[PDB]
Write a protein that binds this DNA or RNA. Sequence first.
RNA 1: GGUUGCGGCCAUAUCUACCAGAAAGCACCGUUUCCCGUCCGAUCAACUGUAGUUAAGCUGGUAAGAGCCUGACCGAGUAGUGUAGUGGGUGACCAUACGCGAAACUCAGGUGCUGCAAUCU
RNA 2: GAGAACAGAAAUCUCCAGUAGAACAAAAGGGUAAAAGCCCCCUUGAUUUUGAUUUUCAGUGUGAAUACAAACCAUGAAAGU
Lengths: 171, 194, 504, 270, 268, 65
Amino acid sequence: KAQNPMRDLKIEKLVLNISVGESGDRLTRASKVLEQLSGQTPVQSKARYTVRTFGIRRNEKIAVHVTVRGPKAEEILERGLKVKEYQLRDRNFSATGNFGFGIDEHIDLGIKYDPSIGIFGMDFYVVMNRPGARVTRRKRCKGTVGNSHKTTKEDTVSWFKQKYDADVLDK
Amino acid sequence: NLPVTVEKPIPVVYDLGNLAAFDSNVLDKNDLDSSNARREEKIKSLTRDNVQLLINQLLSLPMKTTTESVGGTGGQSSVMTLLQLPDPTTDLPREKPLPKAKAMTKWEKFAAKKGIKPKERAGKMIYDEASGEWVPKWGYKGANKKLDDQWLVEVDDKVKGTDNELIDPRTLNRAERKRLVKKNEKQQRRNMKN
Amino acid sequence: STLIPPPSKKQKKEAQLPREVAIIPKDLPNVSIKFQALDTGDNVGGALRVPGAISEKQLEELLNQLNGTSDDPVPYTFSCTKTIDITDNLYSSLIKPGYNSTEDQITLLYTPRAVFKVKPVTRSSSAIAGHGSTILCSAFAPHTSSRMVTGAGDNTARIWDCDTQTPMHTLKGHYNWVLCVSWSPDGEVIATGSMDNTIRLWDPKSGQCLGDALRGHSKWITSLSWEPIHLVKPGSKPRLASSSKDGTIKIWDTVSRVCQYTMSGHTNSVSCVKWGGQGLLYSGSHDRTVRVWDINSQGRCINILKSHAHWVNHLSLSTDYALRIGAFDHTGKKPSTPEEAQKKALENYEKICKKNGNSEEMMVTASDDYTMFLWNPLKSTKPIARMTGHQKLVNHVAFSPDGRYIVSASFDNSIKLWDGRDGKFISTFRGHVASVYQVAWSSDCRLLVSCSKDTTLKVWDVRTRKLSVDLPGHKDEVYTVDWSVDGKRVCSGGKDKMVRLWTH
Amino acid sequence: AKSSAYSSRFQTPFRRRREGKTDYYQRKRLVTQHKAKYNTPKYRLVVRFTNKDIICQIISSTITGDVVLAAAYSHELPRYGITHGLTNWAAAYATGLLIARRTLQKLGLDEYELTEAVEDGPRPFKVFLDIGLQRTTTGARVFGALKGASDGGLYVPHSENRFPGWDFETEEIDPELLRSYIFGGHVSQYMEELADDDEERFSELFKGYLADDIDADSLEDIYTSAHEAIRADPAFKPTEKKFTKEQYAAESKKYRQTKLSKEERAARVA
Amino acid sequence: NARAKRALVKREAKLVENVKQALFIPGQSCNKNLHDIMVDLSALKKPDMKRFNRKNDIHPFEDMSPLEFFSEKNDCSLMVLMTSSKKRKNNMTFIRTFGYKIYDMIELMVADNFKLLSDFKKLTFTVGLKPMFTFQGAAFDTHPVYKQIKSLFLDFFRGESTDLQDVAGLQHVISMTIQGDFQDGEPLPNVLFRVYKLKSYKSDQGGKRLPRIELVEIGPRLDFKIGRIHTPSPDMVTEAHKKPKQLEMKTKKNVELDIMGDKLGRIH
Amino acid sequence: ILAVKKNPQSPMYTQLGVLTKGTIIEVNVSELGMVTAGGKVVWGKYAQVTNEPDRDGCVNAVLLV
RNA sequence: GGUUGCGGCCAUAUCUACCAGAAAGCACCGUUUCCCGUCCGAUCAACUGUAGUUAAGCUGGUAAGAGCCUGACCGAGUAGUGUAGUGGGUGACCAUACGCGAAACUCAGGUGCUGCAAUCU
RNA sequence: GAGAACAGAAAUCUCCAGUAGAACAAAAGGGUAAAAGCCCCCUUGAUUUUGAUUUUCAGUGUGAAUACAAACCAUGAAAGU
């Protein structure tokens, strides 16, 4: 069951997110640096609500995000872990097996700083699932996933321990 | 080679528009009772004879042929031959009553009295003199709302000495247009009430 | 759209009234009939009594039994002479109108027919692009309906695979418009005569050019005709006769790629040349004359036929379909050896040529004097008949594959159907609203297709003498239409630079 | 934390919608809607793709469940000479051609109905294309099967803006690229490109072609021979069955779990 | 909004009415037999059928307002209420409405000796084509109750009315026969409802234009006992059988329209 | 000529049938042999008058194609 | 008997949790030159059935689970609800004959049937 | 409900459950979930034009309004709408 090659946990997708709130030159530079870091054009996200405290109107631009898959996503993930000095908390993981973390200064990832670029923080989020994750996503005969094949927090912690040899910090 | 000439005591009447036949002959209750074992064969044979007569009538009906091909409107192409069904004869009640003609409105009575003929209504496009373009006279990008977007409007002298002096003439014209629209709606609801 | 007048109230009442069923009475007596062959006029069996409950199939089998050829019966169609055909049975065809009764004798003329049946084309199989200019000519392969050759105004021809309706080969040797194309009756080579006063030969399977062009004409090629296979001795390839605007008919031996004979009698442009089945060449030219040359007499002009007052635009022979098809049939079966091909082509020619005693090959000439002339050039120098009635020039003319009907397509927006023996007028196909450019028979002689200046094709049923189906789809004038040998496909081309394939 | 009220008030969809393989919104317009009220029966050419087979079926809707009139599969293509790539564009074309020729042969159009008493000649067979839950894309194998059936001789109403070779800037098609896709020129082009670029991937892919010594230039020839053979003999041959119905039933019932009686279940409870 | 207006226009009255819709309502007491018969008749009626799934406390001869509400909500002019009781076993009530008001009602009971559509296991016809009809027994022509039965079933299964009919669609016939003739002062005989598929064979006596017909039963065979009747008023009958007459050209004396479409007048 | 569709001067002149320059008229085009893409024969189309018939004694028009 | 494609009836078919499935089929699964689409070949599109796998998907078994369904000569012809012979009583109301006519309750049980085509050690 | 720097109850991203408990109109006692909701592509024609047909007007009775139909038109691979 665990010895079967079809239950292995892999990187489904990696989402790089920047939620800058105010739209303009800073949002454009965030989209530019995400394009630099991923090699792909990012996508904006429309405003969902309107709050005077946050100063955001309806249908405004707040954030940008990119999804990366494959060896490029693995390279970006290992750059993020290299910046994170290989120390992950147990609260970064969640019940569904995916995990995220925030980087406050993106210069250490491998991008030379420029005075126009400034300082940007970004959110890494890694989604974990086994092969056969398209059963819930294909057009024809859409179906659920059984519990045994489902992804659990303890199993993805075990996979991370096997892969990166990093202690899961309780506190 | 079975015969196709059904012989009946009482001649069957036909409603070819409804694809129906009616024979008013005598049926034996002992031959049609549920006790018998040949009752289904009797029913099948009676229906067989009536359907034979009906199909003979339908195939004796006049036929419509065409020379048009497929891919056009109509449905019938050159290879198809269609029976021309007559109007149905059986009287059937309608689901809803006939649409009553709406009574003449106040405008219609006035126009009849004054002999005003209805408008030709060729189109909604009018020629704007200041430009060289044809524009809609109402509706989407219509020419009835150009004063709303006019860059400069002269304030009329008659507005002086009134509390409407400081109000935008564009806003005043929008209010007057909306009042005219609501007056038309109220007149229509009055005609519906009457 | 202008509509037919709707039925009135009284007509609707009569329609609601019950109908009468046409049924054969069980007490129908016997009727005496005489079978007479339409082609030969030979009476068979004298007069014989038959019951009134006969069918067309049973009458056909009875006639075969009377002849004594029951092992291999040959289908027939029966008519009574007005001349009214037997549709289903004798009672409902003749006795029901009451013109011929059970007491009087009924003389039924029977005509042989084709065992195969061609379904009418009713829709466009495909619209295929590829030509850079207007399509000027088109033809089908004699052996198969899957290959079509089309010559256009972009100085090229195309070979189209009609199975997938996709282009297969491009023939790019000429420098000017490809005015005519022709597939060899053995199916081995395509000849293209062009506007640049040249003729080229192409291998179709490889889509290649057989060496160099056939040069020698000073004006553009007007028509290409092939030597018949049934006259070509086995082990040899048929020669190519070619007419041109310069008034000459050149004969080309293609194995040696030489020009042998140069007929020169015409004083104006030759409209068409035809290679008949008795070693003769018939040429129609704008000098208002028809010249008959003998290939067995060194190409000398045996006859000059002068009855037209204007250009003879076209000419057709009674055996034209057989000479075009060679040794093939509607089945598409290929002969084993060239000797077998020669014998089979001989039989195919003979079936049409030698009937009712002596072999004859009638000719029809359509001219610019709004008329046609029907000739029998071997027997007499005078025309057999003059066919008049068209208001404008007769552009195209064609004998039926069995040679019993003549169809003329004219510029008066009409087609006229005439009898193929005496040239007497039969009927007028109307429905085109512009000039009819050309026409084509089907293999079983039952259906006709015509292309017009009005951007439409029209398929007509010869038996009912009425329009069968009207096919639009071309965006411009249609210049050429052809029907396959097996009667499965129809190709059309014109000014819209597209090839339309049509099928049932 | 679903409650009894939720489970009682739940309104389940149809079975074919739960295990989604039937689009009822499309199907009701396919079956119950008519352009004219002349009562002409409708037929569907259903085209479906598995991971290893292509299914084409001519189906007439019936009130007690629809009935298949004629069927063809891509696993019958090795019989006609196509043993590799049974789920590509050319395989779809071959399956469409096969089902078209087989239907025409069965109906007698080319080599006692009530229409024979009114008309002299038979109508061309009209079927409407049914694609199910498949994306309509320019160059899809379902439209390849459509092209194959149309060339075979069935009348399927269609426009050509989804065939390969259709230019997007102008409403025109490229029959050269269409013929390349018909005779597998794209697969042969990939075969040559891999053979010249990376022998490693051409070792994995197209291994059977190397095993059978089938060159990258004979694909058109074998497709042409398959088309000729299909047109020559389209009649369906059922596969000769090694074992019988009862034998299959017994052998499968040996593996399927038997039923346990209510008394046995109560004994297990107590 | 535009879709709502289009739905209202489709619902509103017109000179040429659309096909009557049939709504199948199960009652308080229902059975598998009632469900099977309702499914078979809904197959015979569709695509002009709508079916309700829950149970409804409906008594047609005690309160018409739920039926009127259902008819007005679903825009259905034909209604079939399927209920059961000891007094009336397998009761099917056929309601026909005029202008969302109860025009007439018949109340029949299905006999226990019914064969379903699934029992025959025979090939059937294509979905949604109008059938042929045969009515056997002079009571359909003469007696008021059987007059109502004939008109009701013709209206129920008529479907679309057209002036052109494809011969390839002459598939099946519905036969209604009266179980033996009767006299005055006698109980009403049952009505037998049958469905047959046509098979045409060459006759060899009437030529190739007149074939021979044979029938194969598809079901469901039904024996209806005529329990209860509710008749419409004469004014409602006249209002329902009025004609629009806007469609027909007015017929003027001595004026005709000939084959070429010219208006001609006659003088005497 | 079949009808006077639109006189540009006035609808009154349209309904009187005035034929002046610029007037849209309907003309029978049966002899032009026009056929629709659907196969129907066109025998009525629109033309615009391009001359002054009161000045030159004749009506000249250009078809609107 | 399994499985697939197209269906009818639309929970006896649904939800939750374990186990089983030989063959065939189905599916996960490999690649991105081609036609095609996204931020992402994840979905869609194309190619090989070639590297593998029944881990899921799919089906079946199991559960005094939730839910659903069906027969009752079970409630019950009861409650309820309308007319009546001059039936009473100046009284607030009631059995009676004829009509129409339930649900709550109890018992017996159940957890998918089927139409067309093709195929499987 | 689980997680993800600023970012907490309310800003942005991911997973799972989610019969609609949202958003459109009506006042359902059964409206709509591979939608009738949200987003995208195409159409800007929508006051077309023909009619011996229905109704009304006219000193300009083969004109115009009006009803109905048809030919078109839009879109889609198509069924169709």
